[PDB]
Symmetry: C2
Subunit: 55 residues, 2 copies
């Protein structure tokens, strides 16, 4: 009933981004207001994984 988008943020388990999850955040703000997706799943794999589903 609908197509889907996926943003995967990848990096090394080595780094310490004292601002990672915020980047993990603001970035989303950029996809929802442009894709208008109500449905979103973020989970970790280090590799954050955000799957969007559109309207």
């Amino acid at each position: 009933a609908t197509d889907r988008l996926k943003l995967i943020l990848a990096k090394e388990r080595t780094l310490n981004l004292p601002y990672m999850e915020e980047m993990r955040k603001e970035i989303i703000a950029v996809i929802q207001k442009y894709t208008k997706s109500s449905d979103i799943h973020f989970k970790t794999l280090e590799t954050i994984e955000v799957e969007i589903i559109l309207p």
Copy 2:
């Protein structure tokens, strides 16, 4: 040394979104503020948009 961070924006070939640019532009832009890197690389290969960033 050599700290690689990379974003992948997966999409369908079908699905239009005549703007995988700005979507990108904004994601990139953000990224360029939080990591402040000046070494940015984006290749493009069920469409899959990758982007390597090596922070300073």
